[PDB]
Design a protein that fits this description.
Blueprint (H helix, E strand, L loop, with lengths): L1 H18 L11 H10 L7
Family: Belongs to the integrin beta chain family.
Protein name: Integrin beta-3
Organism: Homo sapiens
Length: about 45
């Protein structure tokens, strides 16, 4: 798990830039919820 955790947390360590709150918040501002919306934020155009 040691490297499997370091060699993988890279993504987390990367996605951190978006919700980097998951280390001292995760939920704080809806941002954390917006980081996921970043997916729908491209379809949120309702069209």
């Amino acid at each position: 798990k040691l490297l499997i955790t370091i060699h993988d947390r890279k993504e987390f360590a990367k996605f951190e830039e978006e919700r980097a709150r998951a280390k001292w918040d995760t939920a704080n501002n809806p941002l954390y919820k917006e980081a996921t919306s970043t997916f729908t934020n491209i379809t949120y155009r309702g069209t």
